[PDB]
């Protein structure tokens, strides 16, 4: 199991524009297009992202290319974030993937907002951290995904994904 595989399981793959759990226009492997309500806006964004006129449909290759860029961006955001970096540096490989998953989903900023939890990860207090993480809009809106990531922080294995 690795980060790509993890995230493919969490986000799925769709080749046509769709609405994510929050209602935002999205495509491919969890690729957010725009927070706005306009389908036009979304098509526009897609065209600019792919560099071609798509009529809102993309190929699998095109889907993986966006995903690869999206995973690389998340890592780097983490790595360039004052709050995030120290935490990532402190974790083992499995637990690193779990933080990348959060960032991919909710952004650097959103994650940077889980102060208490983050401090707990830095001290290796896996159970206290899992409880704190669950106390969040994130856990209450998308519980099955959040359970996965959280168990991964708790145990440092891929069991939730297997």
């Amino acid at each position: 199991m690795n980060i790509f595989e993890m995230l493919r399981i969490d986000e799925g793959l769709r080749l046509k524009i769709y609405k994510d759990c929050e209602g935002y226009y999205t495509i491919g492997i969890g690729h957010l297009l725009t927070k706005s309500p306009s389908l036009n806006a979304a098509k526009s964004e897609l065209d600019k992202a792919i560099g071609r006129n798509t009529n809102g449909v993309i190929t699998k290759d095109e889907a993986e290319k966006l995903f690869n860029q999206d995973v690389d961006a998340a890592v780097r955001g983490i790595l360039r974030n004052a709050k995030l970096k120290p935490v990532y540096d402190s974790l083992d490989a499995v637990r690193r993937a779990a933080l990348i998953n959060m960032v991919f989903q909710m952004g650097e900023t959103g994650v940077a907002g889980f102060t208490n939890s983050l401090r707990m990860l830095q001290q290796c207090r896996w159970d206290e951290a899992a409880v704190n993480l669950a106390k969040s809009r994130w856990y209450n809106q998308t519980p099955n995904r959040a359970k996965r990531v959280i168990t991964t922080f708790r145990t440092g294995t891929w069991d939730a994904y297997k």
Side-chain angles (χ1 to χ4, degrees):
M1 174 72 63
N2 53 62
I3 182 52
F4 287 95
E5 266 166 3
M6 192 195 202
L7 279 165
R8 175 72 172 71
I9 286 158
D10 289 331
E11 292 297 350
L13 170 43
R14 334 246 322 239
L15 297 168
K16 170 102 242 233
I17 301 185
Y18 65 96
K19 284 210 229 204
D20 69 0
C21 317
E22 292 300 318
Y24 303 129
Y25 291 125
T26 302
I27 192 147
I29 309 153
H31 182 83
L32 175 71
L33 296 162
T34 190
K35 301 217 197 121
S36 111
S38 169
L39 187 67
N40 307 295
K43 279 126 172 282
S44 115
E45 284 302 306
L46 180 57
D47 283 353
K48 166 170 74 83
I50 292 303
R52 96 190 163 56
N53 232 96
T54 64
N55 232 348
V57 195
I58 62 168
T59 75
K60 205 196 203 152
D61 274 300
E62 279 166 355
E64 303 182 327
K65 183 132 178 194
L66 290 182
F67 183 44
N68 277 322
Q69 295 168 179
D70 289 346
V71 172
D72 185 64
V75 173
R76 292 194 271 80
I78 281 176
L79 305 164
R80 266 200 312 95
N81 184 284
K83 256 337 103 218
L84 266 11
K85 203 211 169 340
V87 188
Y88 183 96
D89 280 343
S90 82
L91 297 167
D92 62 84
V94 184
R95 301 181 171 94
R96 274 173 182 177
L99 180 74
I100 295 168
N101 192 308
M102 280 178 87
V103 175
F104 182 98
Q105 173 189 9
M106 77 205 185
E108 209 173 341
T109 338
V111 189
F114 280 74
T115 291
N116 306 326
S117 287
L118 296 180
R119 188 190 77 270
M120 293 162 210
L121 300 170
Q122 259 166 103
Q123 303 184 87
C124 309
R125 308 161 119 80
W126 322 128
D127 296 355
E128 313 154 51
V131 180
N132 190 260
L133 284 158
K135 299 172 191 171
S136 58
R137 181 187 213 265
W138 170 60
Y139 179 78
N140 292 302
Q141 294 297 130
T142 56
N144 282 343
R145 150 102 174 242
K147 311 213 194 90
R148 287 196 296 274
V149 179
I150 288 181
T151 295
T152 300
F153 274 125
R154 213 207 336 140
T155 68
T157 73
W158 289 121
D159 303 328
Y161 287 84
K162 337 158 271 210

